[PDB]
Design a protein around this ligand. Structure first.
Ligand SMILES: [Zn+2]
Ligand SMILES: [Zn+2]
Ligand SMILES: [Zn+2]
Lengths: 73, 114, 48, 164
């Protein structure tokens, strides 16, 4: 819907400048929670286990592999 | 039986057991939020069901013209108008019980007397 | 037999990692264990 | 002597726990030893079926529905009788009894099958017994150049035939 929108932003005096919008972008958080690796992900996806462990991510985090960006910083 | 989500981050909570305090603690696999479980019920298969004959009701079922009309009354408002229609579930063993919906009391009632 | 709700209580005995093992053992005992009769024979009815 | 002490202690517990108190505790342990010594007379702790009959009588006592089994077992209904009874369906209680016979009647009816009834008339005549009890039925088989078949069967004996 990036065409039809128009902006009513109040100014300090109360002025309403018309800024015709051009595009709209959507942002999500990412790697907030120590994301995993595609390779070992494929090995979990394959039928090596009939069901993968429920706390397997907790065990990997206790191992310390692929930690958070904040923890690495 | 419902699937709770972590209030910090809308993700599927999983059950995991305390190692020593012997309680189910729904820990988030995304973030570190954890929550104790109200009941020891976790999983439920329910291999037999009989449900679905009733719902799908809108507040203006009678606004559609195609439903038939009768003269049995609603046993709350006593108005003689009604809308009747059969089960909304269709199995090969669903019953010929009927569902009667009125406009005055706006109420659903049946014709079974067992 | 005479209770109002017939119940079975079972546990795994061995001197973490419980749910999926117990679910698979549940699925196995439901799918495999014969009771009486002879398998590959189904519902049976009586004509006069 | 593990079983002959354990079941005696079980009957000690399930007779002291009654509202019918034991001031005749010597009579009640006489009842308990009589119960256990006829109980062994099936098995003598040498057969695996010993514990099953014990579980039947034990949880019939501790059932509640009914509690009146305690009163009738303390005021009569002697214990060497109640190995040879095997009346577990028959006792504790009678509403559950009449429930079971309604269930058995329902199952015996529902296990019966299809009984399509073959309406008869006297219009034709059989070939075997030559009776006019023709279980007639009508249907079309051949191509478009004809009407129906006039299928025939006799119901008095079983003779199927056809009319031209
Ligand atoms: Zn979370
Ligand atoms: Zn009404
Ligand atoms: Zn005949």
């Amino acid at each position: 819907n990036s065409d039809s929108y128009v902006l009513l932003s109040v100014e300090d005096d109360g002025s309403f400048t018309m800024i015709p919008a051009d595009k709209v972008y959507k942002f999500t958080a990412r790697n907030k929670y120590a994301t995993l690796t595609i390779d070992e992900a494929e090995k979990r996806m394959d039928k090596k286990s009939g069901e993968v462990p429920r706390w397997l991510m907790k065990h990997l985090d206790n191992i310390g592999t692929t930690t958070t960006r904040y923890d690495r910083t | 039986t419902t699937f709770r989500f972590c209030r910090d981050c809308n993700n599927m909570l999983y059950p995991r057991e305390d190692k020593e305090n012997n309680r189910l603690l729904f820990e988030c696999r995304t973030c570190s939020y954890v929550e104790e479980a109200g009941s020891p019920l976790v999983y439920r298969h329910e291999l037999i069901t009989n449900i679905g004959e009733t719902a799908g009701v809108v507040q203006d079922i009678g606004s559609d013209p195609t439903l038939p009309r009768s003269d049995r009354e609603c046993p709350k408002c006593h108005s003689r108008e009604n809308v009747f229609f059969q089960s909304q579930q269709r199995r090969k063993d669903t019953s010929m019980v009927l569902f009667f919906v009125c406009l005055s009391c706006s109420h659903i009632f049946t014709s079974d007397q067992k | 037999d005479n209770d109002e709700k017939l119940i079975i209580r079972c546990r795994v005995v061995r001197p973490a990692e419980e749910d999926h093992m117990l679910k698979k053992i549940e699925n196995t005992m439901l799918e495999n264990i014969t009771l009486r009769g002879v398998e590959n024979i189904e519902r049976v009815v009586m004509m006069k | 002597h593990k079983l002959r002490d354990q079941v005696l202690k079980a009957l000690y517990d399930v007779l002291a726990k009654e509202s019918e108190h034991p001031p005749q505790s010597i009579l009640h342990t006489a009842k308990a030893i009589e119960s256990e010594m006829n109980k062994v007379n099936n098995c003598d702790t040498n057969e695996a079926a010993y514990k099953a009959r014990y579980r039947i009588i034990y949880s019939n006592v501790i059932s509640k529905n009914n509690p009146d089994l305690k009163h009738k077992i303390a005021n009569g209904d002697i214990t060497p009788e109640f190995l040879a009874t095997c009346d577990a369906k028959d006792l504790a209680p009678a509403p559950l009894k009449q429930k079971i016979e309604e269930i058995a009647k329902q199952n015996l009816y529902n296990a019966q099958g299809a009984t399509i009834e073959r309406s008869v008339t006297d219009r034709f005549t059989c070939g075997k017994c030559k009776e006019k009890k023709v279980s007639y039925y009508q249907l079309q088989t051949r191509s478009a150049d004809e009407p129906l078949t006039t299928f025939c069967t006799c119901e008095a004996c079983g003779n199927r035939w056809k009319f031209s």
